[PDB]
Write an enzyme that holds these catalytic residues in place. Structure first.
Site, PDB file in Angstrom:
ATOM      1  N   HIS A 133     -16.785  31.769   5.386  1.00  0.00           N
ATOM      2  CA  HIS A 133     -16.678  30.483   6.068  1.00  0.00           C
ATOM      3  C   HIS A 133     -17.826  30.221   7.040  1.00  0.00           C
ATOM      4  O   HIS A 133     -17.963  29.082   7.529  1.00  0.00           O
ATOM      5  CB  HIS A 133     -15.358  30.373   6.858  1.00  0.00           C
ATOM      6  CG  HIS A 133     -14.116  30.399   6.009  1.00  0.00           C
ATOM      7  ND1 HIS A 133     -13.880  29.485   5.000  1.00  0.00           N
ATOM      8  CD2 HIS A 133     -13.030  31.217   6.041  1.00  0.00           C
ATOM      9  CE1 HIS A 133     -12.704  29.742   4.447  1.00  0.00           C
ATOM     10  NE2 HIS A 133     -12.174  30.789   5.054  1.00  0.00           N
ATOM     11  N   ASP A 171     -11.409  35.124  -2.830  1.00  0.00           N
ATOM     12  CA  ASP A 171     -10.547  34.873  -1.680  1.00  0.00           C
ATOM     13  C   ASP A 171      -9.753  33.588  -1.930  1.00  0.00           C
ATOM     14  O   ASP A 171     -10.217  32.681  -2.622  1.00  0.00           O
ATOM     15  CB  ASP A 171     -11.441  34.787  -0.430  1.00  0.00           C
ATOM     16  CG  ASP A 171     -10.652  34.508   0.867  1.00  0.00           C
ATOM     17  OD1 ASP A 171     -10.195  33.388   1.057  1.00  0.00           O
ATOM     18  OD2 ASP A 171     -10.499  35.371   1.744  1.00  0.00           O
ATOM     19  N   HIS A 173      -9.224  31.199  -0.119  1.00  0.00           N
ATOM     20  CA  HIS A 173      -9.846  30.039   0.517  1.00  0.00           C
ATOM     21  C   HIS A 173     -11.244  29.768  -0.033  1.00  0.00           C
ATOM     22  O   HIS A 173     -11.968  30.672  -0.474  1.00  0.00           O
ATOM     23  CB  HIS A 173      -9.951  30.259   2.022  1.00  0.00           C
ATOM     24  CG  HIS A 173      -8.639  30.570   2.676  1.00  0.00           C
ATOM     25  ND1 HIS A 173      -8.255  31.860   2.989  1.00  0.00           N
ATOM     26  CD2 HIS A 173      -7.631  29.764   3.090  1.00  0.00           C
ATOM     27  CE1 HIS A 173      -7.062  31.831   3.561  1.00  0.00           C
ATOM     28  NE2 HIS A 173      -6.667  30.571   3.639  1.00  0.00           N
ATOM     29  N   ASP A 264      -6.339  37.670  -0.048  1.00  0.00           N
ATOM     30  CA  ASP A 264      -5.259  36.776   0.464  1.00  0.00           C
ATOM     31  C   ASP A 264      -4.553  36.007  -0.670  1.00  0.00           C
ATOM     32  O   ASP A 264      -3.585  35.308  -0.363  1.00  0.00           O
ATOM     33  CB  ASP A 264      -5.766  35.924   1.618  1.00  0.00           C
ATOM     34  CG  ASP A 264      -7.175  35.373   1.496  1.00  0.00           C
ATOM     35  OD1 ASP A 264      -7.765  35.519   0.422  1.00  0.00           O
ATOM     36  OD2 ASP A 264      -7.651  34.801   2.479  1.00  0.00           O
ATOM     37  N   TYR A 304      -4.350  39.711   4.155  1.00  0.00           N
ATOM     38  CA  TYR A 304      -3.617  39.966   5.397  1.00  0.00           C
ATOM     39  C   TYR A 304      -2.323  40.766   5.255  1.00  0.00           C
ATOM     40  O   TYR A 304      -1.691  41.073   6.275  1.00  0.00           O
ATOM     41  CB  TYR A 304      -3.398  38.646   6.168  1.00  0.00           C
ATOM     42  CG  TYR A 304      -4.735  37.956   6.277  1.00  0.00           C
ATOM     43  CD1 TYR A 304      -5.691  38.430   7.157  1.00  0.00           C
ATOM     44  CD2 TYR A 304      -5.072  36.890   5.450  1.00  0.00           C
ATOM     45  CE1 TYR A 304      -6.937  37.859   7.238  1.00  0.00           C
ATOM     46  CE2 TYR A 304      -6.345  36.295   5.532  1.00  0.00           C
ATOM     47  CZ  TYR A 304      -7.264  36.791   6.435  1.00  0.00           C
ATOM     48  OH  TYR A 304      -8.540  36.248   6.528  1.00  0.00           O
TER      49      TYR A 304
HETATM   50  O1  LIG Z   1      -8.547  34.041   5.071  1.00  0.00           O
HETATM   51  C1  LIG Z   1      -9.130  33.134   5.545  1.00  0.00           C
HETATM   52  N1  LIG Z   1     -10.400  32.713   4.963  1.00  0.00           N
HETATM   53  O2  LIG Z   1     -10.993  33.359   3.845  1.00  0.00           O
HETATM   54  C2  LIG Z   1      -8.532  32.376   6.768  1.00  0.00           C
HETATM   55  C3  LIG Z   1      -9.387  31.572   7.528  1.00  0.00           C
HETATM   56  C4  LIG Z   1      -8.891  30.876   8.627  1.00  0.00           C
HETATM   57  C5  LIG Z   1      -7.532  30.989   8.925  1.00  0.00           C
HETATM   58  C6  LIG Z   1      -6.988  30.208  10.158  1.00  0.00           C
HETATM   59  N2  LIG Z   1      -5.634  29.641   9.898  1.00  0.00           N
HETATM   60  C7  LIG Z   1      -5.432  28.603   8.871  1.00  0.00           C
HETATM   61  C8  LIG Z   1      -4.636  29.060   7.633  1.00  0.00           C
HETATM   62  C9  LIG Z   1      -3.257  29.206   7.716  1.00  0.00           C
HETATM   63  C10 LIG Z   1      -2.588  29.599   6.569  1.00  0.00           C
HETATM   64  C11 LIG Z   1      -3.305  29.839   5.413  1.00  0.00           C
HETATM   65  N3  LIG Z   1      -4.620  29.696   5.365  1.00  0.00           N
HETATM   66  C12 LIG Z   1      -5.294  29.321   6.434  1.00  0.00           C
HETATM   67  S1  LIG Z   1      -4.703  29.553  11.319  1.00  0.00           S
HETATM   68  O3  LIG Z   1      -4.668  30.871  11.919  1.00  0.00           O
HETATM   69  O4  LIG Z   1      -3.341  29.165  10.985  1.00  0.00           O
HETATM   70  C13 LIG Z   1      -5.488  28.413  12.506  1.00  0.00           C
HETATM   71  C14 LIG Z   1      -5.527  26.879  11.877  1.00  0.00           C
HETATM   72  C15 LIG Z   1      -5.591  26.044  12.962  1.00  0.00           C
HETATM   73  C16 LIG Z   1      -4.861  26.819  14.153  1.00  0.00           C
HETATM   74  C17 LIG Z   1      -4.752  28.334  13.664  1.00  0.00           C
HETATM   75  C18 LIG Z   1      -6.669  31.792   8.163  1.00  0.00           C
HETATM   76  C19 LIG Z   1      -7.170  32.490   7.063  1.00  0.00           C
HETATM   77  K   LIG Z   2     -12.543  31.464  -2.969  1.00  0.00           K
HETATM   78 ZN   LIG Z   3      -9.227  33.748   2.850  1.00  0.00          ZN
END
Ligand SMILES: O=C(NO)c1ccc(CN(Cc2cccnc2)S(=O)(=O)C2CCCC2)cc1
Ligand SMILES: [K+]
Ligand SMILES: [Zn+2]
Ligand SMILES: [K+]
Length: 355
Positions: A133, A171, A173, A264, A304
């Protein structure tokens, strides 16, 4: 056929001073490492040492101001760490964060060097914080510097500028940073599978949709496979690889394969909501191993559930070491068929293998 492995306990020092349960835990890497010992994989690997990336290596992808800002956090008090971290989307910072991000990148650089100089065939990098990211000019989503993008550029720096690098980002995301860094580049093919939900899933941008194919000479070299409305798993990922990832990758003919291997999308992940199994990840690894003469570097991104990521990443290393792939099975969820066909039509003009 040596497999390399890099892991350094020092990358555990990056932590969240305000939330002990924050999922991007120090023990993500120690648990994956432990599972490699428990399954007798570690002793089968050649141990590649970690090192700090240099500030000049960070400049391969990142602005001077961004490097300086994260670098300055080593010396900040908690109030300034809080305020700086909150200026980004989804970042926490401790005094050890900059050093940990440097170690994650340097580890991957040493792994790429070992592969490209023929000391090992493939490698795994058990590193944190993640990278995909991070943008040229900003941190985002637990990531300070874009480890995978930096490793592609580092690999080019020690080989030739036109080294063909494939980055497969599995990943859950979208790797917005990696896409943007290489968006106008025809030497780095970026392929991402990711939960998208019509732009509603993090990182919440239509940049992750299938119709973003790259810009200029990069047209065709950015492949987004976005999932909507379904708990995707092994059937859908195997079908995406069969119809999309592998035909495109084979036509590109990479010289180095980097995996932005977040876990994830794994069954059990508290955030991803998906159900890819450890055998599923082993299948995907084995497929990629048919590319680039087997020159594959697997870089940890997200993931996670400590048990899930440990078993999944260990199975990937098992494949890299040459163990026999597991056999997998089986109707896809209907929206995955829609997604795959949407990518096919977006990319058929650029890839003869799709016609
Ligand atoms: O794994 C990653 N990237 O590769 C990753 C990157 C960023 C985050 C942050 N979250 C968002 C989220 C929630 C549930 C599922 N996916 C993403 S959050 O912690 O909820 C944050 C949002 C706004 C306030 C808190 C989590 C994972
Ligand atoms: K990806
Ligand atoms: Zn991710
Ligand atoms: K590209």
């Amino acid at each position: 056929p040596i497999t390399g492995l890099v892991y350094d306990q020092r990358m555990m020092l990056h932590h969240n001073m305000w939330d002990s349960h924050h999922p991007e835990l120090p023990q993500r890497i120690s648990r994956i490492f432990s599972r490699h010992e428990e399954l007798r994989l570690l002793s089968r690997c050649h141990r590649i040492p970690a090192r700090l990336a240099t500030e000049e290596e960070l400049a391969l992808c990142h602005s001077s101001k961004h490097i300086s800002i994260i670098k300055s956090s080593e010396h900040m008090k908690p109030r300034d760490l809080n305020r700086l971290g909150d200026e980004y989307n989804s970042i926490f910072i401790s005094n050890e964060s900059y050093t940990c991000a440097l170690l994650a990148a340097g580890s991957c650089f040493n792994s790429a060097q070992a592969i490209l100089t023929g000391q090992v065939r493939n490698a795994v990098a058990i590193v944190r914080p993640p990278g995909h990211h991070a943008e040229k000019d900003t941190a985002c989503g637990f990531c300070f510097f874009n480890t995978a993008a930096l490793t592609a550029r580092y690999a080019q720096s020690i080989t030739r500028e036109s080294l063909r690098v494939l980055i497969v980002d599995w990943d859950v995301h979208h790797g917005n940073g990696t896409q943007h860094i290489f968006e106008e580049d025809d030497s780095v093919l970026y392929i991402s599978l990711h939960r998208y939900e019509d732009g509603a899933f993090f990182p919440n941008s239509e940049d992750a949709n299938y119709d973003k194919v790259g810009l200029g000479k990069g047209r065709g070299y950015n492949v987004n496979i976005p999932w909507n409305g379904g708990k995707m798993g092994d059937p859908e990922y195997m079908a995406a690889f069969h119809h999309l990832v592998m035909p495109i990758a084979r036509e590109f003919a990479p010289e180095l394969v980097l995996v932005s291997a977040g876990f994830d999308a794994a069954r059990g992940d508290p955030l991803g909501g998906f159900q890819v199994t450890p055998e599923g990840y082993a299948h995907l690894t084995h497929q990629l191993m048919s590319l680039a003469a087997g020159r594959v570097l697997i870089i940890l991104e997200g993931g996670y559930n400590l048990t899930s990521i440990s078993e999944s990443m260990s199975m990937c290393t098992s494949m890299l070491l040459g163990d026999s792939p597991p056999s997998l099975d089986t109707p896809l969820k209907t929206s995955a068929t829609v997604s795959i066909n949407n990518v096919l039509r977006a990319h058929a003009p650029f890839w003869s293998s799709l016609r």
